[PDB]
Symmetry: C4
Amino acid sequence: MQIFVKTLTGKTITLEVEPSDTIENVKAKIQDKEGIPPDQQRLIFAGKQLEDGRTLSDYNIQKESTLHLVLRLRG
Amino acid sequence: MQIFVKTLTGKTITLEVEPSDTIENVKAKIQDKEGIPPDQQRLIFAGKQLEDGRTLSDYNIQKESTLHLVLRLRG
Amino acid sequence: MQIFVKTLTGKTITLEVEPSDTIENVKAKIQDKEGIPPDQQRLIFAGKQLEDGRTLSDYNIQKESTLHLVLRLRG
Amino acid sequence: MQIFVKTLTGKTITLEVEPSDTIENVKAKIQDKEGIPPDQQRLIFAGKQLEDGRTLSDYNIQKESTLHLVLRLRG
């Protein structure tokens, strides 16, 4: 299945994922596509920051769902 | 199976792959060999731009097939 | 299950892991969260240095256990 | 099983591996332990450079075998 990740300027990243993929896997795929390492990534769905160890289905993220990407800064 | 990845100068990278390998896997292997991360890579077969989440067999890419590698620039 | 990795100022990194995870996998997860590559990491449990090729269950590390993270320097 | 990776000054890296592990997997473990990425690594066993896609058993690499590590430079 396909989902989308959007930056805050509305730039979009298209991903191929499975419901059993962890949020961490999704971050790895974002790194694969954009060079942004997982530790610098926060993903948000329905206003909620998503935890690395949980799956997409845990958050009811289904096909064509849109996630939001923001940076994690040091400190 | 074995495939070749050619740069635009005709330089060749030899890879060992399975038809069920994703294009992303191939890019990982190119990184394993040349240090070029996946997000900087564009793979082309028969003039067709190749997507990370799909497999080699999805494109009918066969033994001794040649992919072409070009860089992805920012913006 | 969830474990905690503690830095020496008592800063905490929380991880979701399986007992069958290798120490190396844990290091990969720490890299996923903090950007610290595995080779720079030493993990300690009950005063004992943990080996990359071994599992968490090999060390009898269970849920809510605390590991300590230390740096590996050159030479 | 256990194998050894030796530099040309004879410093040793100890690895635990499977016969079904690829040469690339070993290079990944060498990166995990020393921070040297696979593309900069050449491994030598029995006077021959080892190809990433082969398994250890393809080269008849056995328990207590020692591989030799040399750098790959740009050309």
